[PDB]
């Protein structure tokens, strides 16, 4: 590092203040919903609260709902399931809040500031949970992409309203999906790329293709994506080139940011415990999330005949965005063997409406890791016919044995300054296999 | 021709300067080896000198020898047999020179320039001699190719370090041999075409297949070779297609360049006689080599019970790369009937170490031709199942009676401007039959 330490501390202060805003907003909403400590630590209650906040600030959807009211749902109220424990058993109740009220509470929590960064953080946490839980092979096959490249679908469920953080965290496969959807839309109707809407669509196409270009690593991919962007009315050839680019990302990996976006319950508990994230600072890639997870208790609803350990592992991988990570390193860091998706005896965290909340129980989630490591936004050792041939040569030269991140290991929770790394010595390796 | 005369004169000047460099290097090395005029004109001494020069500049072999020293041969010295005449009889002595010394002498001869073109010229002369002397049917059968297509083995002994000149002069059969060796190497070990080395191997495969494509004449062969190149991990089908392509080259001949690369003794004698190749110019395909051979005396060692005429004919065909040429036209041009290989009472020019240099004598080589002709890089009158059927139809339509090079004849040594051609009127026709 260098004199950029001051810049590195201002960013820490800003992210700490956003975490403080999230936590104290959760505290205020828990007080306004009359939830006890146990219910306030429920992951489903936190998910519902977060979804209500995100729905309250959705400008486009709210405007459309206002202009086209839904069936029996007024466009000025939000809500979701609230799980409250009475006489030992759980019970769900649908709550309804004015969206102006939710926006006012959120603004008051952040000292009268909009703070869209906090909303983006909550959305990224939701996207990480969805990526760690569900496979969207249906959207892959519908768009023509191979369902085998599910490892490139990082941040696929993120809405467009996410800012630069959403673009940074979303993977190459999702960018290819968005571009291919635009290609198909232009193929269906030729009035696309033409007129006043043509300008806006071309601008959006330009911008998404530019940031996909910035996402790649090697020069050949970075030039083929530029060739794809240059075509004014792209057709099947550009779609095929994008397919090839996505396929090449499995070996020539692209740089995708990974951040530890925790559920709002953890931040609320930390703020209630007296932690000042504004003073101490925060970092989504450092020890700060791992340390916070170590000292926090979070409860979750367990469906009948389900394993709490599997659900805790799922929630942990969602928290650390380790859905597509190598299983060996995930198990090494966590200290408990991480079971692939096929052998997880658990369904999604969110509980459907058509469920009987009388055979359901709550289990404490073990969000503890034996070691901690720094999350990276980098790929690995990545060292129109001409570009395709060059890329095929590069992929053929690569092997699944080259060692990447040489000299970088895993640290202990006591090693806050990352002084002494532990290089692992190395079973299954794919989660979604 | 056209205004490209200036371009045609610059090339003549450049090749003349390379010939001057070769000749004055030979003169300097003769002075540094203390050889008389008779020994300096010996073809074996020139071969040894040329081999020492080529070995001195071999980067890869020198590096490997340095890292893995041989048994009793230090990797920083070159040499070879030097035949010196004392009291009437010949005698061989193994000489040893520092490779840095040889490189310094070569650079000083070419005015401080590397001049890899001269080294390529020497290598092409050696390859022409080897093609005119020895049959590599063993390498043909080892690679699976038919030993009957020995006419396509032009420039087979050329090392890879030869530049574009080596690729231009080497025949279609040698290209098929290289491609088939790569195919076999990939069949043996499947880690081929994969990884960092996979990139390099694919690049080399691409390039060799592209220049083989450029070597062919008809469109069907040019498309089948492109089909062969497209396969990412080629197997037995591609090898069979390459075999068929090589077999089709016997009737649908490919364009192979032919150049008259003379031994360094002739160039040294010309430079000593005062010829300025830089001023007068040179051309490997025109009258310049034929005229130079007419005025030059070159001596060679004759083994006991050998015919000097047969060895002179062998050296002449090596000089003019007429190893695979029709015997009738070769005999017409030379003026003396050219005897096929089977009836040549001579072994190779190079004398082995286990030979008695006391029954050996020297004979003057008759490198004189009655006429002279322009060497051509062209074929003749050449006027995946579909491509194979089309090529088979083309070959079946062709006959061994169609007249090619219509209107082009042979010139007299007095006719320097090729004003009046002499069309020959036409016995055996195959050298290696």
């Amino acid at each position: 590092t260098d004199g950029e330490r001051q810049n590195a501390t201002e960013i820490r202060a800003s992210v700490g203040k956003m975490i403080d805003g999230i936590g104290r907003f959760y505290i205020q909403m828990c007080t306004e919903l009359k939830l006890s400590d146990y219910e306030g630590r429920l992951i489903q209650n936190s998910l519902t609260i977060e979804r209500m906040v995100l729905s309250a600030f959705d400008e486009r959807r709210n405007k459309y709902l206002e202009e086209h009211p839904s069936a029996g749902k007024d466009p000025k109220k939000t809500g979701g399931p609230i799980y409250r424990r009475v006489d030992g058993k759980w019970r769900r109740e649908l709550i309804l809040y004015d969206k102006e009220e939710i926006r006012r509470i959120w603004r008051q929590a952040n000292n009268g500031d909009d703070a869209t960064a906090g909303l983006t953080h909550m959305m990224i946490w939701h996207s990480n949970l969805n990526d760690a839980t569900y496979q969207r092979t249906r959207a892959l096959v519908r768009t023509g992409m191979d369902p085998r490249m599910c490892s490139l679908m990082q941040g696929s469920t993120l809405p467009r309203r996410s800012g630069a953080a959403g673009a940074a965290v979303k993977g190459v496969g999702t960018m290819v999906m968005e571009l291919i959807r635009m290609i198909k839309r232009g193929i269906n109707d030729r009035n696309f790329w033409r007129g006043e809407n043509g300008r806006r669509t071309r601008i959006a196409y330009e911008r998404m293709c530019n940031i996909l270009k910035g996402k790649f690593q090697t020069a050949a991919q970075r030039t083929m994506v530029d060739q794809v962007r240059e075509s004014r009315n792209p057709g099947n050839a550009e779609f095929e080139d994008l397919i090839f680019l996505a396929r090449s990302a499995l070996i020539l990996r692209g740089s995708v940011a990974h951040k530890s976006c925790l559920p709002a319950c953890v931040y609320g508990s930390a703020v209630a415990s007296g932690y000042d994230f504004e003073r101490e600072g925060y970092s989504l890639v450092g020890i700060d999330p791992f340390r916070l997870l170590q000292n926090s208790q979070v409860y979750s609803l367990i469906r009948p005949n389900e394993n709490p350990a599997h659900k805790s592992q799922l929630v942990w991988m969602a928290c650390h965005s380790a859905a597509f990570e190598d299983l060996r390193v995930s198990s090494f860091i966590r200290g408990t063997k991480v079971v692939p998706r096929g052998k997880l005896s658990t369904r999604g965290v969110q509980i459907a409406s058509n469920e009987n909340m009388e055979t359901m129980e709550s289990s404490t989630l073990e969000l503890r890791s034996r070691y901690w490591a720094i999350r990276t936004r980098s790929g690995g050792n990545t060292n129109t016919s001409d570009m395709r041939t060059e890329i095929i040569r590069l992929m053929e030269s690569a092997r699944p044995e080259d060692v990447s991140f040489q000299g970088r290991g895993v640290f202990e929770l006591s090693d806050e300054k990352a002084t002494s790394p532990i290089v692992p010595s190395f079973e299954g390796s794919y989660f979604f296999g | 021709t056209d205004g490209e005369r200036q371009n045609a004169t610059e090339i003549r000047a450049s090749v003349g300067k390379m010939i001057d460099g070769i000749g004055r290097f030979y003169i300097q090395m003769c002075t540094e080896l203390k050889l008389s005029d008779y020994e300096g004109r010996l073809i074996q001494n020139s071969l040894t000198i040329e081999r020492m020069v080529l070995s001195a500049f071999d980067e890869r072999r020198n590096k490997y020898l340095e890292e893995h020293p041989s048994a009793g041969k230090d990797p920083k010295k070159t040499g070879g047999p030097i035949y010196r005449r004392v009291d009437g009889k010949w005698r061989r002595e193994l000489i040893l020179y520092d490779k840095e010394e040889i490189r310094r002498i070569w650079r000083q001869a070419n005015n401080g320039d590397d001049a890899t073109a001269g080294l390529t010229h020497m290598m092409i002369w050696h390859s022409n001699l080897n093609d005119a002397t020895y049959q590599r049917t063993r390498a043909l059968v080892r690679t699976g190719m038919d030993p009957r297509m020995c006419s396509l083995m032009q420039g087979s002994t050329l090392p890879r370090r030869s530049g574009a000149a080596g690729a231009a002069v080497k025949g279609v059969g040698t290209m098929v041999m290289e491609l088939i060796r790569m195919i076999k190497r990939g069949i043996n070990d499947r880690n081929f075409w994969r990884g960092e080395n996979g990139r390099r191997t694919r690049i080399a495969y691409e390039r060799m297949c592209n220049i083989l494509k450029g070597k062919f004449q008809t469109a069907a062969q040019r498309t089948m070779v492109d089909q062969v190149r497209e396969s990412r991990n080629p197997g037995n089908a591609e090898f069979e297609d390459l075999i068929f392509l090589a077999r089709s080259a016997l009737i649908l001949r490919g364009s192979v360049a032919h150049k008259s690369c003379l031994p360094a003794c002739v160039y040294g004698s010309a430079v000593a006689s005062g010829y300025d190749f830089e001023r007068e110019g040179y051309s490997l395909v025109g009258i310049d080599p034929f005229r130079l051979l007419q005025n030059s005396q070159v001596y060679s060692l004759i083994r006991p019970n050998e015919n000097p005429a047969h060895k002179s004919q062998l050296v002449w065909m090596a000089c003019h790369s007429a190893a695979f040429e029709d015997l009738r036209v070769s005999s017409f041009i030379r003026g003396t009937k050219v005897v096929p290989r089977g009836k040549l009472s001579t072994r190779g020019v190079q004398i082995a170490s286990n030979e008695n240099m006391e029954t050996m004598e020297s004979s003057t080589l008759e490198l004189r031709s009655r006429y002279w002709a322009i060497r051509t890089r062209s074929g003749g009158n050449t006027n995946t199942s579909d491509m194979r059927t089309e090529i088979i139809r083309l070959m079946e339509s062709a006959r061994p009676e169609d007249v090619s090079f219509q209107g082009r004849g042979v010139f007299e040594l007095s006719d320097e401007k090729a004003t009046s051609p002499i069309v020959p009127s036409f016995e055996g026709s195959y050298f290696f039959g």
Binding site: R148, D326, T376, G380, P400, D402 | -
Partner: peptide, 28 residues
Amino acid sequence: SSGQISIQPTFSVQRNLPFDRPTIMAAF
């Protein structure tokens, strides 16, 4: 049957980044 074929390295840890080479390169 389809499934995950590559690995996306979220953690900065000395690894080998596995991928199923025969199936990926079979597409070309």
